[PDB]
Amino acid sequence: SVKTFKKGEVIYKDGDKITAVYLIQSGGANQCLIRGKKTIDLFQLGSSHILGDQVILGQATHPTSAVATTETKVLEIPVETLKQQYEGAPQMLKVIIKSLADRLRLAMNDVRSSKMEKDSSPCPEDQVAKVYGAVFHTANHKGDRSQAGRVIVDWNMMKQYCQRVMGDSPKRIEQAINILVKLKLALYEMGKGPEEIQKVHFLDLGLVESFFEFYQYYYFKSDLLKVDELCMQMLGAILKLSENEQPDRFGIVGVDFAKFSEFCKEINLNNDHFARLEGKGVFMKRKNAGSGVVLQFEVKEFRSILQSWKMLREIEKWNEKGFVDMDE
Amino acid sequence: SVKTFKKGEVIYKDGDKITAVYLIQSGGANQCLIRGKKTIDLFQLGSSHILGDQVILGQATHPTSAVATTETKVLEIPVETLKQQYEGAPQMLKVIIKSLADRLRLAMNDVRSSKMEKDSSPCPEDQVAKVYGAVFHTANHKGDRSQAGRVIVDWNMMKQYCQRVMGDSPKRIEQAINILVKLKLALYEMGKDPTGPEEIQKVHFLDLGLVESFFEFYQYYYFKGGRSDLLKVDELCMQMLGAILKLSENEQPDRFGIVGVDFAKFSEFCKEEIGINLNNDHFARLEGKGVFMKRKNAGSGVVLQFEVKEFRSILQSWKMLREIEKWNEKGFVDMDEKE
């Protein structure tokens, strides 16, 4: 009997009685604590690991939760089989196994109590700039640059550098670069029984530097770093509307109020939506022409603002959930 | 046979080959890392635990030292007894043990890792390469290069970019740059704020290459493994390296960078200047610190080949390590020490 779990499926929840013992034959199980919508990662166990062996200690309940990180095939072992095979082991191996499991228990205890002792959140407000900063400088100093504008960095050669020289968890680093690839700002070269990432391609570091400079500028001194979904929806709606208009000499593209008002209804535009938009950074140069009022603006400004807003939105998605989902 | 240790006795030291395996029948044994005066307590095991069970998975050297915390009685078990008892065990028990011990290693590393975050010392070890990697990069990416040979950085901009993008307390950054200034590798442009005791306005980095060399050295030797004594700057080794780099100062290197020094002159100006006869033991020390040399019998005698760049960078990094130790002790960097 082998059990096949799909990616993201719950193998067992914290508190459930151990009905069988799973030997991971392929894939990966994330031992964690599913906490409402947040999922605090504990450990990642690949093949030849045993889940639910706590029954050796006489335990009846799973201490942690486990989630499949990939299609995970495990071998189902009857609990009493493992029980009677441990009870019938030579005395010294019994002592060694009890000691090992007991110490692992204790270590699991401090781990859970520590991971929750501090860091109330994945990506704290005081680490956004810092984190990406790390990424940037790493790719800016140790990356292959002889290509058409993309910077290639060995995955391990970054998991090292960002953790030793920059002081950043490789998990948070991977999640930030995951946000980058989800916004088609970066790419993942993969390969290598198992399949792992070998390199990472950064299409554009400039945007990364712009983002962390902007975040560190507003955060260390806000009403702009709170991304309002309505304002983003409006910014993205007007950006598409102004996509065809001719860029001016100074680069000011206007939009007739008629089409805009209609689009917004796609609720009812008034000056309060304008004011809510103002506090988010985007300013509208209102002008009067024969066609009525036209909302002139610079595209070099509004495009960058929408980008940084998408960045902040993905960071909020990272904080609310605990990780970055790239399937949607 | 049962061995009875008194409170304080060392059951074994780290690095010692496991010759025996002790089953704690009573008492307790603290597992730690004895390094001179500093003692890093890791984990404590009482009765019904086996010390030395790591030999199953092929450790063959003790990962940590073990000291008895009270009167402790242990049963001595031969290593080959346990190894043969394990190799003849069912494969199910083997995979159970392997998975258990690997998961225990993972959780132990997660505990030791999150404990070093609580370090309150001025410049923790695991932070050294982070502090300079932060200083260097900032000065390398925001510094004004108008004056040749040096990189000028505004002081407030330096502090802010280190705190907000590199995540470093401005006090620690200031003390690291103090170490830099003290070693003639940086300067401090003094201005008068609107308030006259003067005030740091800008910092001049005379040599960022040395900074990168040092933090690469440190990141490469700190995260290596259990052998973390390569960072202990040995006064005996530093004196000898300074002596040999003072000797080989008028030699021209070829495309590899190597220069020579008469083994004669080296030993003679080593005994008559320091006070020791050069022998094979001293070189066993500088070899374990990172100082390797090529001996070749050609012409006048045995000549010692080494690239001056590597040895001078190691000497500067040794200065750095000694200053970091002084900083950790005093709490600041006395820029007027003057050894």
Got the DSSP string for B159-196?
HHHHHHTS---HHHHHHHHHHHHHTTSEEEEEE-----
Distance of CA B142 to the CA centre of its chain: 30
**Topology match between the domains A128-221 and A229-310:** yes
Which amino acid appears at position A301 of this protein? E
Q: How was this structure determined?
A: X-ray
In CATH terms, B2-87 corresponds, of 2.60.120.10, 3.40.47.10, 2.60.40.2220, 3.40.190.10, to 2.60.120.10
CB A225 within 8 A of CB A202: no
Of A90, A133, A219, the CB nearest to B166: A133
How many Cα atoms within 13 Å fall on the side-chain side of residue A244? Answer: 2
Of B45, B100, B110, the CB nearest to A111: B110
User: Which of the residues A21, A77, A119, A164 would you substitute to probe the B interface, choosing the one with the greatest number of B C-beta atoms within 10 Å?
Assistant: A164
List B115's β-bridge partners, or say none. none
Going by C-alpha positions, the residue among B236, B111, B121, B218 that lies closest to residue B169 is B121
Would you say how long chain B is, in residues?
339
Chain B residue with the nearest C-alpha to that of A129: B165
Q: Where are the domains of chain B?
A: 2-87, 125-225, 232-314
Q: Where are the beta strands (DSSP E) in chain A?
A: 2-5, 10-12, 20-26, 29-35, 38-45, 50-51, 65-68, 72-78, 151-154, 186-191, 196-202, 252-253, 285-289, 292-298
User: How many Å is the maximal CA-CA distance in chain B?
Assistant: 81
Distance between CA atoms of A229 and A215, rounded to whole angstroms? Answer: 18
Of A85, A108, A220, the CB nearest to B93: A85
Q: Is B48 left (phi over 0), alpha (psi -120 to 50) or beta?
A: left
In CATH terms, A128-221 corresponds, of 1.10.10.10, 3.90.550.10, 1.10.10.60, 3.40.50.1980, to 1.10.10.10
Tell if the CB–CB gap between B100 and A99 is shorter than 8 Å.
no
CB B135 within 8 A of CB B178: no
Going by C-alpha positions, the residue among B327, B273, B266 that lies closest to residue B131 is B327
Tell if the CB–CB gap between B160 and A220 is shorter than 8 Å.
yes
Q: Please report, to the nearest 10 degrees, the dihedral formed by the alpha carbons of residues B170, B171, B173, B176 taken in order.
A: 170
Chain A residue with the nearest C-alpha to that of B133: A165
Would you say how long chain A is, in residues?
328
Distance of CA A86 to the CA centre of its chain: 41
Give me the phi and psi of B114, to 5 degrees please: -75, -10
Chain B residue with the nearest C-alpha to that of A77: B92
Distance between CA atoms of A75 and A52, rounded to whole angstroms? Answer: 12
Distance between CA atoms of A49 and B217, rounded to whole angstroms? Answer: 36
Query: Other C-beta atoms within 10 Å of B206: how many?
Result: 15
Tell if the CB–CB gap between B127 and A90 is shorter than 8 Å.
no
Query: Other C-beta atoms within 10 Å of B178: how many?
Result: 18
Chain B residue with the nearest C-alpha to that of A136: B165
Tell if the CB–CB gap between B133 and A166 is shorter than 8 Å.
yes
Q: How many angstroms away from the CA of A285 is the closest CA of chain B?
A: 33
Give me the phi and psi of B9, to 5 degrees please: -65, 140
Sheet holding A186-191, edge to edge: A151-154, A196-202, A186-191
Q: Please report, to the nearest 10 degrees, the dihedral formed by the alpha carbons of residues B313, B319, B325, B331 taken in order.
A: -120
Going by C-alpha positions, the residue among B112, B134, B111, B109 that lies closest to residue B123 is B134
Give me the phi and psi of B251, to 5 degrees please: -120, 145
Task: Tell me the fold of A2-115.
Answer: Jelly Rolls (2.60.120)
CB B158 within 8 A of CB B207: no
CB A264 within 8 A of CB A237: yes
CB A114 within 8 A of CB B114: yes
CB A257 within 8 A of CB A249: no
CB A163 within 8 A of CB A180: no
Per DSSP, helices labelled H in A59-205 are 79-87, 91-115, 128-142, 155-164, 170-182
Query: Other C-beta atoms within 10 Å of A283: how many?
Result: 14
CB A2 within 8 A of CB A71: no
Cβ neighbours of residue B105 closer than 8 Å, sequence gap 6 or more: none
When computed from its CA atoms, the radius of gyration of chain A, rounded to whole angstroms, is 26
Task: Tell me the fold of B232-314.
Answer: Arc Repressor Mutant, subunit A (1.10.10)
Task: State the CATH architecture for B125-225.
Answer: Orthogonal Bundle (1.10)
Distance between CA atoms of B82 and B87, rounded to whole angstroms? Answer: 9
User: Which of the residues A100, A125, A140, A213 would you substitute to probe the B interface, choosing the one with the greatest number of B C-beta atoms within 10 Å?
Assistant: A100
Of A93, A95, A216, the CB nearest to B48: A95
Cβ neighbours of residue B338 closer than 8 Å, sequence gap 6 or more: none
Q: How many CB pairs (< 8 A) connect A and B?
A: 132
CATH class of segment(s) A229-310: mainly alpha
Of B90, B107, B215, the CB nearest to A165: B215
How many Cα atoms within 13 Å fall on the side-chain side of residue A282? Answer: 29
Chain B residue with the nearest C-alpha to that of A132: B165
